[PDB]
Design a protein around this ligand. Structure first.
Ligand SMILES: *Cc1cc2c(cc1C)nc1c(=O)[nH]c(=O)nc-1n2C[C@H](O)[C@H](O)[C@H](O)COP(=O)(O)OP(=O)(O)OC[C@H]1O[C@@H](n2cnc3c(N)ncnc32)[C@H](O)[C@@H]1O
Ligand SMILES: *[C@@H]1O[C@H](CO)[C@@H](O[C@@H]2O[C@H](CO)[C@@H](O)[C@H](O)[C@H]2NC(C)=O)[C@H](O)[C@H]1NC(C)=O
Ligand SMILES: *[C@@H]1O[C@H](CO)[C@@H](O[C@@H]2O[C@H](CO)[C@@H](O)[C@H](O)[C@H]2NC(C)=O)[C@H](O)[C@H]1NC(C)=O
Ligand SMILES: O=C(Nc1ccccc1)Nc1ccnc(Cl)c1
Ligand SMILES: *[C@@H]1O[C@H](CO)[C@@H](O)[C@H](O)[C@H]1NC(C)=O
Ligand SMILES: *[C@@H]1O[C@H](CO)[C@@H](O)[C@H](O)[C@H]1NC(C)=O
Length: 496
C-alpha cells in the first residue's frame, strides 16, 4: 500500500523504473562496482523528498534503501541503492533560485544538489567566494559535506564542514529540520562528515570571503622528503595569532620511473622546466621528486602585483627547496579554482568518467609521514607505472571539529595523502587494488594510526576503528534517532 504523496511522484513521472534511469544510477566515478536500484526519483522540489522519506518512515516493512546521488563521484558504490531507490539530486536544480548569496555578503545559501562550480559562479557575480574548497569543482555541496571537503585551503580555514553556518536536512523520518550550532546541533554535527546516514542536505549555508581576482601560483622542487615536508609544515603552521600569507598549500610526489612524463603532465611545468628537474633528479640520484604547490590570492589593485612579489620573495627566503627551483605562474582566481575540470575538458588524461579509479585517500599522522614516504613512495610504488597524481599535504587538527562525524588522526598535524591511480587494462585494475591493500597492510604492520577518507569499509570492526569506539557510539545514537529503519545511503556499508 502506497501513501497518496508517494503515488503522486509515480504519477508525475518523477519516480521511474525504466532500464535507462536505473542503469545511469547504477555506476559511479570509481567504475569498479555497480548495483542496480529498483527505482530512481527525480524530485522537482524538496517536498518530493519529504514525500518519499515520510512514506518510508510511515510504512511498516518498507524494504527499499535510499541513496542521494549528487554527481556519483563516489569511488566504491557509496551513492548506490541496490534493489532500492536512488534520488537524482540534480533534478532540484531544474525555480525558485537554488543559490542565494546573502544580502550582507557574509554567506551563500546553496541547494545540497548544487555543484561547487555553480556556487563559485553565483558567488563571484556578487563579489564573494567560499573559503574552503575541494580540488575538483564538479562535486555537490551535500556530497562534499557528507565527507569533509578538503583542498589546499583547509590548513587555515578547515575543511568545508568547518565552513557551514547552518543546513536544511530532511531526516530519515521524513521531517524537514533546520540545524546549526544553536538549533538542533546534534543533527548538524552528525550530517557533517555523516556519509549520508541521517538525512539529505537540501540547503547549506556556506561561509564566504571577499573574492580575490588573481592567484599567484608557485611550485617549489625538492629531492629530499625531509626538506619538502618541513617546508610544507612551515607554510601551514599557526603563528605565535593566525596562519601565514599562503592561501593554498598542497604537494606532489613524482616517482623516478615516469618523472619526465609526469612533470610534463602537471599542466604547470614547461618542457624547459621538465628538463631541468629531470637533470636535478639524476644529479641527486633521487628515486622520488617532491613539489610544493602554493598560491597567494590578491585583487586587481595597482600595488597588489608588487606587494605579492615582495610577500612571495619574503616567504621563499625562509624555505629550503633546491636553489633556483621556484616556478611561478599568475592566473585568474576562478581559473585556478577550476583547474581540474579545466584539464578534464582539455585532455582528461585520467579518463575521468571513462576508466576505473582505484583511488586511495587517507589521513596520515605527521609523526609517521616519513615512514609512509619510505615504505610507499620509496618502496611499494617504485618500479611501477603510475597514471595519476600523488598528492601529499599537511592539515591542522585545530581547524577540524571532532564533534562532527568526520574522523581524523589524533595528532595536531596530519597529512592528506591522495593516491589517484587511473587504471588502463583490466590487469592494471586488479594490480592497483592489490597495491592499495598492500599500502594499507604496510601502515597496519608499521602501527601507523591513519584514517581513510571517502572510502567505505565492509567490516563492522573496521568502521568502529575508523571512528574510534566512543565516537562510533554517538554515530549509532544518531543513526537510531534519524534513520531507525537504516534505509539511507546503504552503499557506505555501515549499517547495510
Ligand atoms: C570524482 C572526484 C571526487 C573528488 C575529487 C575529484 C574527483 C575527480 N576531489 C576531491 C577533493 O579534492 N577533496 C575532497 O574532499 N573530495 C574530492 N572528491 C571526492 C568527493 O568528495 C566524493 O566523491 C563525494 O562523495 C562527493 O561527490 P558527489 O557530490 O558526487 O556525491 P556522491 O558520490 O553522489 O554521494 C556521496 C555520498 O553522499 C550522500 N549524499 C550525496 N548528496 C547528499 C546530500 N545532498 N545530502 C545528504 N547526503 C548526500 C550519498 O548518499 C552518498 O552516500
Ligand atoms: C532562495 O530564495 C528564494 C526566494 O528568495 C527562496 O524561494 C522560496 O522557497 C520557499 C521554499 O521552497 C518557498 O516557500 C517560497 O515561496 C520561496 N520564495 C520565493 C520568493 O520564491 C528559496 O527557498 C531560496 N533558496 C535557497 C536554496 O535558500
Ligand atoms: C630512474 O629511471 C630512469 C629511467 O627508467 C633510469 O635510467 C635508466 O637507467 C638504466 C640503468 O639501470 C639504463 O639501462 C637505462 O637506459 C636508463 N633509461 C633512461 C630512459 O635513461 C634511472 O637509472 C633511474 N634512477 C634511479 C635513481 O632510480
Ligand atoms: O582528486 C583529488 N585531486 C585531484 C584530482 C585530479 C587532479 C588534481 C587533483 N583529490 C581528492 C582528495 C580527496 N578525496 C578524493 Cl576522492 C580526491
Ligand atoms: C565502467 O565504465 C565502462 C565504460 O563506460 C562500462 O562499460 C562499465 O560498465 C563500467 N563498469 C562499472 C563497474 O561501472
Ligand atoms: C643511487 O640510488 C640507488 C637507489 O636508491 C642506489 O642503489 C645507488 O647506490 C645510488 N648510487 C650512488 C652512486 O649513490
Amino acid at each position: 500500500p502506497w501513501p497518496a504523496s508517494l503515488a503522486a511522484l509515480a504519477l508525475d513521472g518523477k519516480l521511474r523504473t525504466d532500464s535507462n534511469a536505473t542503469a545511469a544510477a547504477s555506476t559511479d566515478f570509481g567504475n569498479i562496482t555497480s548495483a542496480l536500484p529498483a527505482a530512481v526519483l527525480y524530485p522537482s522540489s524538496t517536498a518530493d523528498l519529504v514525500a518519499l522519506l515520510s512514506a518510508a518512515n510511515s510504512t511498516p516493512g518498507w524494504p527499499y534503501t535510499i541513496a542521494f546521488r549528487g554527481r556519483g563521484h563516489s569511488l566504491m558504490g557509496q551513492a548506490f541503492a541496490p534493489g532500492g531507490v536512488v534520488v537524482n539530486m540534480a533534478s532540484l536544480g531544474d525555480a525558485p533560485p537554488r543559490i542565494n548569496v546573502s544580502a550582507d555578503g557574509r554567506y551563500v545559501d546553496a541547494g545540497g544538489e548544487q555543484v561547487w562550480i555553480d556556487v563559485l559562479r553565483a558567488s563571484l557575480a556578487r563579489g564573494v567566494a567560499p573559503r574552503s574548497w575541494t580540488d575538483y569543482l564538479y562535486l555537490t555541496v551535500g556530497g562534499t559535506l557528507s565527507n569533509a571537503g578538503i583542498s589546499g585551503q583547509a590548513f587555515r580555514h578547515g575543511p568545508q564542514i568547518s565552513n557551514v553556518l547552518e543546513m536544511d536536512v530532511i531526516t530519515g523520518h521524513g521531517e524537514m529540520v533546520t540545524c546549526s550550532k544553536q538549533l538542533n546541533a546534534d543533527l548538524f554535527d552528525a550530517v557533517l562528515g555523516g556519509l549520508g546516514q541521517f538525512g539529505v542536505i537540501t540547503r547549506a549555508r556556506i561561509a564566504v570571503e571577499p573574492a580575490p581576482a588573481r592567484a599567484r601560483w608557485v611550485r617549489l622542487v625538492y629531492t629530499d622528503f625531509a626538506a619538502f615536508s618541513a617546508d610544507q609544515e612551515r607554510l601551514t603552521a599557526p603563528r605565535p595569532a593566525s596562519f601565514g600569507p599562503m592561501s593554498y598549500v598542497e604537494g606532489s610526489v613524482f616517482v623516478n620511473q615516469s618523472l619526465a612524463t609526469d612533470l610534463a603532465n602537471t599542466g604547470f611545468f614547461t618542457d624547459a622546466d621538465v628538463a631541468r628537474i629531470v637533470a636535478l633528479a639524476g644529479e641527486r640520484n633521487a628515486t622520488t621528486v617532491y613539489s610544493i604547490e602554493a598560491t597567494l590570492n590578491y585583487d586587481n589593485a595597482t600595488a597588489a602585483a608588487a606587494a605579492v612579489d615582495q610577500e612571495l620573495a619574503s616567504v621563499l627566503g625562509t624555505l629550503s627547496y633546491v636553489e633556483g627551483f621556484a616556478f611561478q605562474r599568475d592566473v585568474a582566481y576562478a581559473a585556478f579554482l577550476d583547474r581540474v575540470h579545466g584539464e578534464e575538458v582539455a585532455l582528461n588524461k585520467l579518463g575521468l568518467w571513462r576508466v576505473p579509479h582505484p583511488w586511495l585517500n587517507m589521513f596520515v599522522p605527521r609523526s609517521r609521514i616519513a615512514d609512509f614516504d619510505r615504505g610507499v613512495f620509496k618502496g611499494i610504488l617504485q618500479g611501477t607505472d603510475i597514471v595519476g597524481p600523488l598528492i601529499v599535504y599537511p592539515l591542522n587538527k585545530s581547524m577540524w571539529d571532532d564533534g562532527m562525524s568526520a574522523a581524523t588522526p589524533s595528532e595536531d598535524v596530519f597529512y592528506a595523502v591522495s593516491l589517484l591511480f587511473s587504471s588502463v587494462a583490466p590487469n592494471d585494475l586488479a594490480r592497483l587494488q592489490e597495491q592499495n591493500r598492500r599500502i594499507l597492510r604496510f601502515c597496519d604492520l608499521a602501527g601507523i594510526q591513519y584514517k581513510t577518507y571517502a572510502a567505505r569499509h565492509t567490516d563492522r570492526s573496521d568502521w568502529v576503528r575508523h571512528f574510534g569506539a566512543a565516537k562510533w557510539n554517538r554515530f549509532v545514537e544518531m543513526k537510531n534517532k534519524y534513520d531507525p529503519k537504516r534505509l539511507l545511503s546503504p552503499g557506505q556499508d555501515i549499517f547495510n
